[PDB]
Amino acid sequence: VCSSEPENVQADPENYTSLLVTWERPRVVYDTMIEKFAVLYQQLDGEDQTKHEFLTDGYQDLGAILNNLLPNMSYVLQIVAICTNGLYGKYSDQLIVDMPT
Amino acid sequence: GLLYPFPKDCSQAMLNGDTTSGLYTIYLNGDKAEALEVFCDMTSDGGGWIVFLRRKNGRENFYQNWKAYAAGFGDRREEFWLGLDNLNKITAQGQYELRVDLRDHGETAFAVYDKFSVGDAKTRYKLKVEGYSGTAGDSMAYHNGRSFSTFDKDTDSAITNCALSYKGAFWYRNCHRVNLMGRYGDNNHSQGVNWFHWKGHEHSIQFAEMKLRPSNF
Ligand SMILES: [Ca+2]
């Protein structure tokens, strides 16, 4: 439903505790239109398994900055489109990012 | 050239009796030392418009840097951009309204905004635009209050670089409902000559002009 997956997800630490993630628009949208994207991330090998969700403002700014991340910790993230009827599209492939110490 | 010997816009030029569209010399603040050759549209809704953007065939490059958009570029009888410094000086000499004329595959539409001004370089040419009427849909209200952005001077509200991503220059926010300096003929999402409330983000418009004249002319 909604759309195919966001493509070519990339992520680089910006500062000591932040991460800049970018992606490309899904190639296929099924019926409803894409309204925004969700950036879903969690610690990979840490004890705090809290699942975080950052929602973008609109559908054109294909990037997000995640703040308050821990140095010396790896994170896994996925991007997904959200359509005007609230349905989620296909999730991007997982991307593993390591924050430096 | 008798009522206004040094007409400060195309509306004063038209009052002098110049009723055919084409190139005319205006004089900012009525000053003979500040001459500027502009294209006047003398027919749209009575006429008297300074044209400051024209797209019609994709021959001119609009992916240009900050200095080019400040100074202007192109042949004013063809595709061109008048320049942000000029736009500031014109919109500061009085109260001006904006008109956008759009044409695509035999269909036409227009938008008029009762108030239009561009700030000076120190505001990074901040846009003020309000008071919509017309048939194209109110797509410029989204851009009200934004500074100008080029690929080499990102001032937009986006995490990314709108001008770099969407192959143009504009008063981008995050990113646009209007992209009339986008890439000609590019129907890829948000990359073309877009007016969202008329043709959306996946249809590049064949012809577009932005123009200005005094409010209540
Ligand atoms: Ca930006």
The residue ranges of every structural domain in chain A are: 1-101
Alpha-carbon distance B186 to B157, whole Å?
24
Q: How far is B117 from chain A (nearest CA, A)?
A: 26
Interchain contact A65–B (C-beta under 8 A): yes
> Which residues are CB-contacts of A32 (< 8 A; sequence separation ≥ 6)?
A2, A83, A84, A85, A87
Q: Which residue, chain included where needed, has tokens 């942000």?
A: B84
The secondary element (H helix, E strand) that includes residue B66 is helix B66-71
* Cβ pair B159:A64 closer than 8 A: yes
Q: Is some CB atom of chain B closer than 8 A to the CB atom of A62?
A: yes
Concatenating the DSSP letter of every residue in A35-93 gives EEEEEEEEESSSS--PPEEEEPSSSS--EEEE-SPPTT-EEEEEEEEEETTS-B-PPPP
Q: Which of A20, A25, A63 sits opposite B189 (nearest CB)?
A: A25
CB atoms within 10 A of CB B200: 14
Contact B189 A58 (CB under 8 A): no
Read off φ and ψ for residue B40, nearest 5 degrees: -100, 125
Structure tokens at B14: 């038209």
Cα(B157) to centroid(ligand 1), Å: 6
Distance CA B92, CA B86 (A): 10
Q: In terms of DSSP bridges, do strands B80-81 and A52-55 run parallel, antiparallel, or are they unpaired?
A: unpaired
Residues 6+ apart with CB under 8 A from B189: A25, B201, B202
Beta strand A34-43 with A95-98 is unpaired
DSSP state of B147: P
Q: What are phi and psi of B66, to 5 degrees?
A: -60, -45
* Residue B135 CA, ligand 1 centroid: distance in Å: 31
Q: Are B69 and B56 in contact (CB under 8 A)?
A: no
Structural tokens at position B39:
């294209």
Chain B residues whose CB is inside 8 A of the A20 CB are: 159
> Which contacts of B83-87 are long-range, i.e. CB under 8 A and separated by 24 or more positions?
B84/B118, B84/B121, B84/B125, B84/B148, B85/B120, B85/B121, B86/B36, B86/B52, B87/B52, B87/B118, B87/B125, B87/B212
- Domain ranges within chain B, ordered by starting residue: 10-213
Query: Which among A25, A57, A62 has CB closest to B160?
Result: A62
Distance from residue B140's CA to the centre of ligand 1 (Å): 19
Strands B194-195 and B178-179 turn out to be antiparallel
Tokens for A4, please give them. Answer: 């195919």
Alpha-carbon separation of residue A10 from A23, A65, A76, A87 (angstroms): 6, 12, 12, 24
Cα–Cα distance, B175 to B162 (Å, whole number): 6
Give the C-alpha distances (Å, rounded to integers) separating B95 from B114, B117, B184. 9, 8, 31
CA B136/CA B170 separation, integer angstroms: 19
Which parts of chain B are beta strand (E)?
A: 22-27, 35-41, 49-55, 73-74, 80-81, 96-104, 107-118, 127-134, 178-179, 194-195, 207-214
C-alpha B172: how far from its chain's center?
14
Are A64 and B189 a contacting pair at CB < 8 A?
Answer: no
Do the bridges between strand A7-13 and strand A52-55 make them parallel or antiparallel, or are there none, so unpaired? unpaired
Q: Would you tell me which residues 2-41 of chain A have a C-beta closer than 8 angstroms to some C-beta of chain B?
A: 20, 22, 25
B160 CA distance to ligand 1 centroid (A)? 5
Would you identify the CATH topology of the domain B10-213?
Gamma Fibrinogen; Chain A, domain 1 (3.90.215)
Which residue in B131, B116, B133, B101 sits closest to B213, CA to CA? B116
To 5 degrees, how large is the angle CA B171–CA B186–CA B143?
Answer: 15
Rounded to an integer, what distance in angstroms lies between the CA atom of residue A50 and that of residue A39? 14
Angle at B157 between CA B52 and CA B109, to 5 degrees: 40
Under 8 Å CB-to-CB from B81, ≥6 apart: which residues?
B52, B53, B62, B64, B68, B69, B72, B73, B74, B181
Q: Resolution of the coordinates in A? A: 1.9
* β partners of residue B68: none
Report the alpha-carbon angle B159-B160-B164, nearest 5: 155
CA distances from B93 to B27, B88, B117, B119, B216 (A): 11, 9, 10, 12, 15
| Nearest alpha-carbon partner for B180 in B76, B96, B75, B56 | B56
What is the amino acid identity at position B203?
A: H
Three-state helix/strand/coil letters over A13-26: ECCCCCEEEEEECC
3-state class (DSSP) for residue B163 = helix
User: DSSP labels for B87-142?
Assistant: HHHHHHSS-EEEEEEEEETTEEEEEEEEEEEE--GGGTS-EEEEEEEESS---SGG
Q: Report chain A's terminal Cα–Cα distance, integer Å.
A: 40
Residue B176: in which H helix or E strand, if any? none
**Cα B123 to ligand 1 centre (Å):** 17
Q: How many CB atoms lie within 10 A of CB B164?
A: 14
Torsional class of B68: left (φ above 0), alpha (ψ -120 to 50), beta (otherwise): alpha
Residues listed for chain B: 217
Q: ∠ CA A63-B154-A60 to the nearest 5 degrees?
A: 35
Q: What one-letter code names the amino acid at B126?
A: K
